[PDB]
Amino acid sequence: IKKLSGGIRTALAQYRELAAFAQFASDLDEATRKQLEHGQRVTELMKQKQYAPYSIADQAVSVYASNEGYMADVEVKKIVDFDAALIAYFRSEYAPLMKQIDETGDYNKDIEAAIKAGIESFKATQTY
């Protein structure tokens, strides 16, 4: 989580830097528009329900998926459904990896590769 939270921090800060011109999106730079887009995606991702706690593995998977840009091809809506579907899939078929992340909390090349493989397997061949 320490390795992963930096992208969330910087994305939210960059989105915060342009609060005034949110209502003037017509007159803005394209790069500023992309920063607005990513900030909106992160802000939508940050939502959660009640009496539904997350283990560290779920947060790790969601944050890693957000950081590398896998969430940039969906609309602002359906983000919560995408997150829930991905988490359910990962818990449904990737039990050993989830247990290892929950009980240890380590981060190395093998763990990152396995997480990326699972996320890319979800990206296709599945529905929201």
Next chain:
Amino acid sequence: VQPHVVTVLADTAIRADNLDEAAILEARKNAEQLLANQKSDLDSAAALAALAETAAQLETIRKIKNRAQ
């Protein structure tokens, strides 16, 4: 041309002190480009930042008019 009136129409015309006029017209081009850029900058700076800054925060005061603390 005719004996009583003389008129010549030209699409582009200017006093031909030389066989070329690009070196003279480029000054007008620079003036026009500079005026356009400065006008855009002035409009943006005067309106977009200032009006939004004024409209940024007004309700936190209106909502507390009847407060007695």
